[PDB]
Symmetry: C2
Subunit: 305 residues, 2 copies
Amino acid sequence: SRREFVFENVKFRQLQKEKFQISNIPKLNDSQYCKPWLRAEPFEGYLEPNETVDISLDVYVSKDSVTILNSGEDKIEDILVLFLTISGNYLPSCFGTSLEALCRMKRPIREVPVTKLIDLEEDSFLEKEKSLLQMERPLQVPKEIWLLVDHLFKYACHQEDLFQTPGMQEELQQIIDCLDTSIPETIPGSNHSVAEALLIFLEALPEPVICYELYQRCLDSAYDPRICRQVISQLPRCHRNVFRYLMAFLRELLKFSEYNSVNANMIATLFTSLLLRPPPNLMARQTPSDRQRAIQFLLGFLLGS
Amino acid sequence: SRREFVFENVKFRQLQKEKFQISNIPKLNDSQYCKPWLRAEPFEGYLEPNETVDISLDVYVSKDSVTILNSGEDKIEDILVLFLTISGNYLPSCFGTSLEALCRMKRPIREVPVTKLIDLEEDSFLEKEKSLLQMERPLQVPKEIWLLVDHLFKYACHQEDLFQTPGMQEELQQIIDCLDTSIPETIPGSNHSVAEALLIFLEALPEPVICYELYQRCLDSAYDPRICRQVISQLPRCHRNVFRYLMAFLRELLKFSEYNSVNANMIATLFTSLLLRPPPNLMARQTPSDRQRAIQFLLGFLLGS
């Protein structure tokens, strides 16, 4: 019935349907089969008469595909077999972009340019060498994380089960689209949704707040809060600012454990796996005592000096 | 029970409640009574026992108050009598701001500044004379009108009863807040809501697309489409561009009368009272033949050369 398929404007954590029917499962080299951000269901069955099999095609970019697609490495182009043709375009997101790159962009990653409205004429003598064949101070912290944290500061310090309750999937999308296209005056959604988007953000980061190269150093000094401060100072500029900003926010949260039910241990446990992660290419084993050190490393700042 | 009242962050076409009770109507000089963007209901009644009268206080800035508040002339400060104290703050809107001022602002009128994130130190020797006691090319068209019109171009040319059906009051608010704080990638709401916000925008303008000083000239030449083009050329830069842009959009709409049900006469009648208005201080009479000329003036461009 249908053969050609295109998914226009695909975005992080947004599902797109492309239902269709069949009437009367293969996979090419599973190395060239399909794409992780794409799958079929039902992708196989039994038929013999005229009965129509309404097989659906869905795409969903998760934390595992967001960063390759952002950069461009991968594109919304996948080839199946039965050959199948499908394409579209992927809209970049601040989620899955380095803190480094984000601190250099004062505007949303997808802000609409007003270029076609500007009333002027660039130097024509400057284009005397142009051709159709010939193609500053970084922010202390990404505005995106700032918008999320400042919001929680202002409206969620007294939120019950804060960082224990999962937000609304639908509000998470809004929040994401919001940060990708504007510097909102008010982040939409409930405190739970905003709190989760922050975790999702820290998790999708290409390079953790605490750089991989410093991962082990932190573990080794986890019990000496003074040495931990020093390791932090070793981090690149924006990583250290983002780290310090988060600890300040989390400490502020503790002052209201009475109302929000957050305790140092819970918080430190929750955030450490997002902030302090092992170099993935070393497929390093995660010992239970290494887990305690990773937790202690954060507790040091949440109760330190 | 309550005496002090404050309405924080009041905005164009957004109602704010401030309910309270009483138990056991006056007005100061009605010249100093209350403010049009404020009223009471119930504002009078009968009582003698302990019964509590839950009188509500509401504020609503409409097309008549938006522009004075934007500029600042008026502030959310009104004094009642029984003396009553109430205040707050008003957030400016692009709705009710001149086309002149809007073409000079490349950013939303209320975009969140990222100043407190910037990582740098301004010249301290430049502040060697500073003191706590001592305080470029305009766009061809306001981005706000551009965002509204381009949206209708892209998604509403085939909308049924377009410009005949009123949008959702709740979506109109969103759209307004959207344009005031961001350069949206996608205006929220249905085509009917977007179409109405455009009318609301043209109506709240401080100075009509066609300047008051040229109002009569247009009427006088309404039957000579060639002279009408010339009068348009007389308009200040941005007013002529906005006018031409609108006519192009409306003509495009006519090419699909079949689908959207819009006809030149309906359109021209609807838009002329928004685009071509009489200098209000002349309390000029609106004769039925002057109404036909005002309509003809627009028809000339919708069917002209």
